[PDB]
Design a protein around this ligand. Structure first.
Ligand SMILES: [Zn+2]
Ligand SMILES: [Zn+2]
Ligand SMILES: [Zn+2]
Lengths: 263, 46, 65, 134, 114
């Protein structure tokens, strides 16, 4: 089908290794940035501390709380509180989580992301459930407690983008390479005796034909074939990090087209 | 549970008028820490 | 003072991996580098996160109050 | 990042890189001398006084002290005290004009002389900003 | 303390408008477009597409200061061709490329196993 082309090399719940051909580098990169910064997610944006006899500071705990990945599957059915007509927050624009933990045992008591309890009405939307990729099913150690120790708090998880705070990135590293053979001459290699001998060969070199020494420089050539690998934090499935990345970018171009109309 | 002052030594919840000096009831230590508010503190998880 | 959630550089969740790492070291008697790799901590930014972490919380939990 | 500047990653700062806690303890005692003349830890009002700071005294409880967990900023009076002038004279302690944070721990004890003496610990979390040194 | 709110990166202020079109003073058929609350993501992508147009004589973007989200786009077109129309086609071309990609990735994804 028509323009840009995709070829999936590897795929799992956590990653997609794919080849993006018949595309401009401006597009490949704009797409790359959108997956990092602009795909909406759900994360803890407010913590009310009832009890903290823990060894860690309120704001230190509150910080890590925001860093816990939360289900963001059905995120477009949730409003940004700023657009929501409620006073403050509500089920149309937020998810409410509860955290009550006490040191019952003489041995150390660990507090996990599995211990947050959804207290608001999710209205059948797949949202707010802490992401657990742990084998023991605990996921994310928030805190540790001693005997008399207690932590009682309430969380308001809201919709947002990494551009506002990194906690909202469905993100994780985006492996990105083009022209593994430097045929384009986009980089001048630093060497001592031999750049070829001194620079390790890219795994992507198998997927491309070597330049061949008896050939003059291809001055007219342009980059089109981007070897990418998108890693997912958990909040959104990999296919979605890319699909919503495409969708978001498409959307923000449409807002320009609509802006031209308005004036 | 009208918490005013906790003992720094034994974690005993207690309280007394400025006419009852410092000290702890059933510990005797003169340390004492003030009780956390009930006002409740709100944080942005950033 | 407790495993950071997420690697500072890339954002990979690391806060769920600490206990598993200690077990890999102790129970399985593995080396730190293979322990890190078994956890799926492939890049060095994610590797420094865990290998370099100092868990002072254990020390703090020792104070009787 | 020229002439000794540096470019720091905001995203890694959001994840906690080089973030730190800051604590500041403020101290006070009820007087130095006076057989009948003793300073008092209390929340001061009128009583002719007028030598007040304000900086709202409004975060103080009846003992003249703020409870741990209250947010303090500006010149909010953190310890309320009066000198008996024979009516009251203000001896209250404001939070450092430029500082802000949450009251962390409030210690009420006695000195070897039998002096009601207090220590107030305030807590700020400092996140890496533009003119910060590394 | 003197830090702006992070929403100021992507949220328009009261008084601010997305696009602000100014006629260029230095050349005929040239226009300068200030894009508010947008960075390199939109700027690079648009500038690149405008160069793909044979009736586009000039296309460049710049983000004058990193502190502010805004960028400026300069378009010069062929006599008869309006810069706003050139920006329009560039946008639709991007949208049609993005649409094509979404489907092509979705098709590929479905063939996968894991
Ligand atoms: Zn609402
Ligand atoms: Zn006691
Ligand atoms: Zn990393």
């Amino acid at each position: 089908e028509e323009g840009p082309q995709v070829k999936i090399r590897e795929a799992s719940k956590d990653n997609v290794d794919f080849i993006l051909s018949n595309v401009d580098l401006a597009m490949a990169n704009s797409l790359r940035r959108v997956m990092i910064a602009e795909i909406p997610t759900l994360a803890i944006d407010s913590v009310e501390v009832e009890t903290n006899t823990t060894v860690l500071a309120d704001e230190f705990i509150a910080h890590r709380l925001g860093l816990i990945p939360l289900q963001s599957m059905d995120i477009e059915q949730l409003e940004y509180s700023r657009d929501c007509f409620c006073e403050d927050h509500c089920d149309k624009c937020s998810v409410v989580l509860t955290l009550q933990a006490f040191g019952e045992s003489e041995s150390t008591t660990n507090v996990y992301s599995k211990d947050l309890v959804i207290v608001s009405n999710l209205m059948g939307r797949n949202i707010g459930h802490p992401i657990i990729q742990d084998k023991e099913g605990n996921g994310v150690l928030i805190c540790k407690l001693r005997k008399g120790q207690e932590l009682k708090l309430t969380c308001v998880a809201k919709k947002g983008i990494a551009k506002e705070h990194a906690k909202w990135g469905p993100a994780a590293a985006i492996e990105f390479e083009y022209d593994p053979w430097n045929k384009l001459k986009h980089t001048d290699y630093w060497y001592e005796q031999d750049s070829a001998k001194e620079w390790p060969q890219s795994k992507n070199c198998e997927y491309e034909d070597p330049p061949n020494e008896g050939d003059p420089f291809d001055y007219k050539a342009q980059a089109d074939t981007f070897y990418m690998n998108v890693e997912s934090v958990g909040s959104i499935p990999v296919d979605q990090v890319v699909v919503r990345g495409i969708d978001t970018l498409q959307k923000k171009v449409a807002s320009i087209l609509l802006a031209l109309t308005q004036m | 549970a009208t918490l005013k002052y906790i003992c720094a030594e034994c974690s005993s919840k207690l309280s007394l008028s400025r006419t009852d000096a410092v000290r702890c009831k059933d510990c005797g230590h003169r340390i004492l820490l003030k009780a956390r508010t009930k006002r409740l503190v709100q944080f942005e998880a950033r | 003072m407790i495993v950071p959630v997420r690697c500072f550089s890339c954002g990979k969740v690391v806060g769920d991996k600490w206990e598993s790492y200690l077990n890999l070291l102790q129970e399985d008697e593995l080396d730190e580098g293979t322990a890190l790799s078994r956890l799926g901590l492939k890049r060095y930014c994610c590797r420094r996160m865990i290998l370099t972490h100092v868990d002072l919380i254990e020390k703090f939990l020792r104070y009787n109050p | 990042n020229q002439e000794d500047s540096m470019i720091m990653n905001q995203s890694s700062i959001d994840r906690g890189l080089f973030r730190s806690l800051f604590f500041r303890s403020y101290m006070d005692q009820e007087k130095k001398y006076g057989m009948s003349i003793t300073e008092t830890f209390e929340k001061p009002q009128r009583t002719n006084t007028l030598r007040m700071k304000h900086g709202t005294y409004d975060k103080l409880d009846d003992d003249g002290l703020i409870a741990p967990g209250v947010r303090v900023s500006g010149e909010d009076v953190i310890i309320g005290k009066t000198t008996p002038i024979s009516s009251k004279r203000d001896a209250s302690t404001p939070l450092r004009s430029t500082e802000n944070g949450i009251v962390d721990q409030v210690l009420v004890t006695t000195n070897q002389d039998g002096l009601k003496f207090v220590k107030v610990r305030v807590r700020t979390t400092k996140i890496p900003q533009i003119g910060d040194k590394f | 303390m003197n830090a702006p709110d992070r929403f100021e990166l992507f949220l328009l202020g009261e008084g601010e408008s997305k696009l602000k079109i100014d006629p260029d003073t230095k050349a005929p058929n040239a226009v300068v477009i200030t894009f508010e609350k947008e960075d390199h993501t939109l700027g690079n992508l648009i500038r690149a597409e405008l160069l793909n147009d044979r009736k586009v004589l000039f296309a460049a973007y710049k983000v004058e200061h990193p502190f502010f989200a805004r960028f400026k786009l300069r378009i010069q077109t062929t006599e008869g061709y309006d810069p706003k129309d050139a920006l329009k086609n560039a946008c639709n071309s991007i949208i049609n490329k993005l649409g094509a990609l979404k489907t092509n990735f979705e098709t590929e994804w479905n063939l996968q196993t894991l």
